[PDB]
Amino acid sequence: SLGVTQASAQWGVKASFQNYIRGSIANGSWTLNGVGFDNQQFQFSGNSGAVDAENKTGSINFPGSIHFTGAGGILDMQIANIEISFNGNSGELIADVVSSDMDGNSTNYGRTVVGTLNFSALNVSATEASGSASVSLSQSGSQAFADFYTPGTQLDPISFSATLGGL
Template sequence: MRGLNVCVLGPAALIVTAVLIALTPMTSNAAVLDAAGTPSAPADVTLAADSDSCDVTDAAITWGLKESLRSYISGTIANGEWAVSDGATYETPNFGWTAGSGQLDAGSGTLAFDGSLRLTGHDGILDTTLTGLEIVFDGSTTANLVFDVFGTTQEGLPVNESAVEFATIDVSGITVADGVATLAGAPVVLTEAGSEAFGTYPAGEEFDPITVTFSANPECMPQPQDGNQALLSALIIVGAIIAILVAIAIVLILGRRRRRKRAAAM
């Protein structure tokens, strides 16, 4: 019985220790150099800041919506146009929104923008307005692009929807340096709700990349962590458990051999 306790309880304790170690987040205090060669905090470390949240008043967006859509609307088939108002702008080939405001806390929050974009064509059959633009962050690597959508779709169907989660934005490439958060050329994908309200394109359609900037610090808008970290941690856990199970098997086999030798000697 005593030999069994040593052979089993000892390795069992090792399993528990190994799993706890593997589950412990791996962080590094090493500095990371930004593009200018200036040391900054690594992706999983938050720098100390004057406050835990950011009051944003200067957010700006540059976005072409969708190049092929612009070409279609301005072409001879739709024979249409687009118009911006209430603060939105257009400078070929991008639409712009400025003076966005809101609050962010540890990467979560909403930035709201004034400005409307109206798309018309097909002799008035298409008459869709996008307004009430918001970018909603939830602390993950994906943010939601939200619009109020009203008018008629390209098929002439009426639409009047508020706070439509129009598209998703991949924000994994966001950087924070010198007090400015920058998301440059981020992928934008139309959602199911966006497809239903906007028409023309199915969910999953890629729209033009978007660029967003606003004042921030690493604490209120930290850079998202590397998505491979969770996979690495899982592999470490599995590897540790396999190694310990192999060790247990070896110990048990050796223990049985010893007991057999003792029994044979008696």
């Protein structure tokens, strides 16, 4: 089992969601704490997790939060502490999620699977792990998005790279 030395990830959540949040209906915004933003993707930086290079499994852990607001404060969604977990060419995108419903009532989703990952590329070696995966919204994620997306909705893809060490 190898430790994660430095990891980075890029994920836009969903391009059409970014456009909706900033557009004339939601009339909203996002703020970021420990997360960047560039080329329509949120930017994550972490130094924890572990990878099994022989079995091609692992977890890559990131700190930081994205906070979406809109609809006069009725929309209020936080996604924090994302984790990319993988076992072979499939995995899970896990995060701490809190989101308000269309009545303005906040619901805490715990540390939940936000989406299922299917890797189109995944390389794991002694010194590096990297890959790209489609992200399919989970049932809990659908509820957090106020049912505007069905479970199984394809979100933006997620990519990551990590240097590994410390066996």
